[PDB]
Write a protein that binds this ligand. Sequence first.
Ligand SMILES: [Mg+2]
Ligand SMILES: [Mg+2]
Ligand SMILES: [Mg+2]
Ligand SMILES: [Mg+2]
Ligand SMILES: [Mg+2]
Ligand SMILES: [Mg+2]
Ligand SMILES: [Mg+2]
Ligand SMILES: [Mg+2]
Ligand SMILES: [Mg+2]
Ligand SMILES: [Mg+2]
Ligand SMILES: [Mg+2]
Ligand SMILES: [Mg+2]
Ligand SMILES: [Mg+2]
Ligand SMILES: [Mg+2]
Ligand SMILES: [Mg+2]
Ligand SMILES: [Mg+2]
Ligand SMILES: [Mg+2]
Ligand SMILES: [Mg+2]
Ligand SMILES: [Mg+2]
Ligand SMILES: [Mg+2]
Ligand SMILES: [Mg+2]
Ligand SMILES: [Mg+2]
Ligand SMILES: [Mg+2]
Ligand SMILES: [Mg+2]
Ligand SMILES: [Mg+2]
Ligand SMILES: [Mg+2]
Ligand SMILES: [Mg+2]
Lengths: 90, 183, 336
Amino acid sequence: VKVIDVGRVVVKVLGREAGRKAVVVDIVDENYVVITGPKSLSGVRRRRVNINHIEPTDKKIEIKKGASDEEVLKALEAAGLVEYMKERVK
Amino acid sequence: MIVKKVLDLSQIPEKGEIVIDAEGHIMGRLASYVAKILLSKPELRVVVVNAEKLVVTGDRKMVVEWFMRKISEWRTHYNPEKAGPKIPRRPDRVFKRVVRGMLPKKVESGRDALKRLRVYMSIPLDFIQRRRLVLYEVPAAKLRVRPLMQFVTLEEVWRSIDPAAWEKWNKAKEVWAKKIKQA
Amino acid sequence: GLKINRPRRGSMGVYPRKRAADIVPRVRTWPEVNLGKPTLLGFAAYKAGMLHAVVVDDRPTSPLYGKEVVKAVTVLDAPPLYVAAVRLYTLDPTNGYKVAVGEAWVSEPPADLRRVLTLPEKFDTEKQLKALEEYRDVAVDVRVLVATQPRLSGIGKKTPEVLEIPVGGVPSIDERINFAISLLGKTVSPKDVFTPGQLVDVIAVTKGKGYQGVVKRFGVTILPRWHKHRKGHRRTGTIGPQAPALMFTQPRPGQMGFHQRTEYNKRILKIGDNGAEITPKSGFPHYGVIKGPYILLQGSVPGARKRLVVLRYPVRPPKKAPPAAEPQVVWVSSQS
RNA sequence: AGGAUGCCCCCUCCCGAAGGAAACCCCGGUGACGGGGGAGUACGAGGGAGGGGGUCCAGGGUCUGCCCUUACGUCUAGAAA
RNA sequence: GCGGGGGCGGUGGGGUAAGCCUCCGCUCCGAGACGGGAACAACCGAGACCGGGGUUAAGGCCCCCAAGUGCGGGCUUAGUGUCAAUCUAAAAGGGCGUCCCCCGCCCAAGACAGCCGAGGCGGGGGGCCCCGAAGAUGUACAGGGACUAAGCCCGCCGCCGAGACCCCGGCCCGCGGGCCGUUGGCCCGCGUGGGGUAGGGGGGCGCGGCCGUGGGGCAGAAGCCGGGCCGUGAGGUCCGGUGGACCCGCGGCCGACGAAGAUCCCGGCGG
RNA sequence: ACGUCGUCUCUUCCCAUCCUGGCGGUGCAGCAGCCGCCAAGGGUGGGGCUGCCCGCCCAUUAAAGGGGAACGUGAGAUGGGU
RNA sequence: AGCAUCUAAGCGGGAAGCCCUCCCCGAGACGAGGCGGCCGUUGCCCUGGGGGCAACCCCGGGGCACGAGGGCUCCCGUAGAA
Ligand SMILES: [Mg+2]
Ligand SMILES: [Mg+2]
Ligand SMILES: [Mg+2]
Ligand SMILES: [Mg+2]
Ligand SMILES: [Mg+2]
Ligand SMILES: [Mg+2]
Ligand SMILES: [Mg+2]
Ligand SMILES: [Mg+2]
Ligand SMILES: [Mg+2]
Ligand SMILES: [Mg+2]
Ligand SMILES: [Mg+2]
Ligand SMILES: [Mg+2]
Ligand SMILES: [Mg+2]
Ligand SMILES: [Mg+2]
Ligand SMILES: [Mg+2]
Ligand SMILES: [Mg+2]
Ligand SMILES: [Mg+2]
Ligand SMILES: [Mg+2]
Ligand SMILES: [Mg+2]
Ligand SMILES: [Mg+2]
Ligand SMILES: [Mg+2]
Ligand SMILES: [Mg+2]
Ligand SMILES: [Mg+2]
Ligand SMILES: [Mg+2]
Ligand SMILES: [Mg+2]
Ligand SMILES: [Mg+2]
Ligand SMILES: [Mg+2]
């Protein structure tokens, strides 16, 4: 089963930003979540996304619900995932 | 050894033979992909193994009754061997018949395509003994398992409509289990 | 439908009524019997003729219990069977089919077997048995290949009949294999297989009657008030409705007889060693004399008067078995 | 009796109607996808020029594969009937 | 020609109803090719000179079958159902089966159910499904495979797809203009020009003879068998073989002038 | 120009079930009866009367159901009626 | 849905009906099957063409021999319209 949780690093599999990495920062409902690249980092804008269009990775950072990009970027440093985000899958 | 791969629907080879492991696949959805592959690659041979692990969605009683009606009520009053239907029951023959229904009818290209398909229950020993056996899956034809969903396997259907024949095949599996396990 | 209800004319369970593919019965079913020792599950014998016997009824609940009753009996001429080969069977894992995995032959088969088989001058039996042993652990069934010895029968022909008879009696496959191998090159007499008073099934090709009309073949009625009908009376009226057209269930003339049939639960009344005690002084009509062992069966048996008949242990025995004691045959009609 | 100054293949070159992409960069959308650039480009019916190689081409008989396809004449609103 | 027919509309009027009878109007079939509708004159799309390229229409895009196992939300558990009509179906009624909307009342934690502690009772309606739901050669028929979505509802994105529309080449036509001694021929321009039964109008091919004119033939006429070339075509012409004495081009004129069919006639000859 | 009633013969299909299998209700004590549901594998016969079909009747019977197949079947019969 | 409820998940029982068991046909079952065994897997002759000609080799046609197995002819009947 697919599990999407706040802080999880995910990969987008649909849309122009396909193959890019992103961080889940909020939950809208059972079907949509909010992800942020951060944009300056991986090229993913801060938008809602349907769960069907993302796949979870094995990496997770710790943040609060609705975390800002700077808070996300800082948490990406305490985990050392900065170069993990710039890599494009497939 | 057995190597499991995902079949690339755009990177099918034009020659040779691919082996598809049918376990966990929906029968009609896998048949649709298999039928298209055989027509679009007129030189490729397709082998389907584990045909008894194909899944038919729906209530078990509903699926079994559908098969019971097919093998019982569908008949001819003319010479039965010359003019009537001959309904398959075994999972490998059942699945091959399903693919036939998705191929062009009464033409050579439809006939040639079916002759390029082989379906097996479980994995034949000669395939197992190979140094490197590549088994493909077709994820779009795989069953997405959800709670409270009803489905049956072609093996359970066969057991329902031909118990003595299923028992012999089941016993054969037990008899050769040690040698199959060795290979 | 019909104007007045009545059952259909003849069975469609024997469709098609064609000539048997072989004059020798080919048995599809062999029962699983627990006898406590290994043994052949069947025997083959030649039908010699029919008589009648005075038998004491031994069924305690029967209304004729203890009385002498006259029963029609069939005499089988049963020279010993010669065991020529042992064959092993396994199950094909792909489909569960029973498949032969090998067989071991006697080194020096009798010269009469060469009338039917393409054999080498000598079989190297020890190698064949060695190869056979490799398949012991996947064996599910073992059968012997037996040849009849028609020279020892009243027919006197030389060409033998060859068929497979399984070994049963115990559930253990290994003991059945060991017993079957011990039989290679030896003969089997009817007393080695059956015991007097037991029930057997009989399988044979029935007597041939050639091309026959629909009245005899299916029992359709001769058209009533027979003289009234133009174009004959030994016929059906119509041969079908308008639709569906001639169906396969419509009675039609054709071959009658020479089919393989199975009859159940025939009691063995006596297994004799010397047929001179049962052969009538005139001989068996159209058969000859019996000089070796014979089997006396209660009732009738399918087949013409020289047909090879296969007896097997019953596959539909009744709930209550016959009495353990041998039946008392007081007198047979071929005697003084 | 037709062409053999042919036909076929390859390569190169020129022109080209209607129409006409892609990789990739940028903007939007959950997304299938849209838009700016790449680009009226690559290409595109056909029309011109040359070079290398081969041997028949057209036409015909018959068979196979794929696609299409409900004998004729007639009265009739209506014919495979 | 004075037999019409289909779709839709006038609750047309009649009739239990009818692929029913009888009016009124637009369109289509008859007399209209082609794409879709499973097949199918008249339902949808659309009007076809010939060849080729391109783009769309109706409709479709899991396989059969070209193009999506396309995107978001919700519903159904009955294989219900599976994108209008011809076309193979369903009613009154029952169901909190399940999803949802509204109203009235009780509970201010002393409500409902048998002290406990938080929601509870009733009414009205909507969606899908279940029962109501029974037939005769052969399977959950309504294209088949099969599908739990490849079903249904609210929306959305791209693509495929005709002879239509666009383009190129060729042809023909109507009308107008011009040239040539012309019972006719040729050239140019324009056309939101190019389907067609009955019928009307215009031109050509072939057969037998006649009036002229020009020729061929024993070094081989007509006829016949097979073949190449020319013409949209009727047909013309040439070649090889066979044959053995007549025949043809061009202009004009005339007919005992063209056959696939008549339970056609006569002869011959089949299964 | 599709041989016009019935019957005979012969085969198959439907189920809205008369009996046989299963179950329930009853104003079901028992013996019987009545009513509903599932179920079409098998059975549903012999005679009298009439050209019949239908129907009435007789003796039985577990019961002696009803329909479709070009009003199944006349290049199979019969030919009593029309 | 604090109770209750055969049902929503799960489980037990439950028909002459369905499937298997049983009988018949059966590998043209074109995925045309399994097993054991027997045989062949060779030569010579005549003639036409081609290559280099020095043998030679390749190809076309025919004939003969080897060879398991099969048939006709013969005497018959467990069989039978042929
Ligand atoms: Mg067959
Ligand atoms: Mg008569
Ligand atoms: Mg020339
Ligand atoms: Mg008419
Ligand atoms: Mg009419
Ligand atoms: Mg016509
Ligand atoms: Mg009129
Ligand atoms: Mg009208
Ligand atoms: Mg008309
Ligand atoms: Mg159509
Ligand atoms: Mg496709
Ligand atoms: Mg109504
Ligand atoms: Mg349905
Ligand atoms: Mg026109
Ligand atoms: Mg003239
Ligand atoms: Mg005509
Ligand atoms: Mg004539
Ligand atoms: Mg004749
Ligand atoms: Mg007629
Ligand atoms: Mg007729
Ligand atoms: Mg007639
Ligand atoms: Mg019923
Ligand atoms: Mg009739
Ligand atoms: Mg008649
Ligand atoms: Mg008739
Ligand atoms: Mg009369
Ligand atoms: Mg009269």
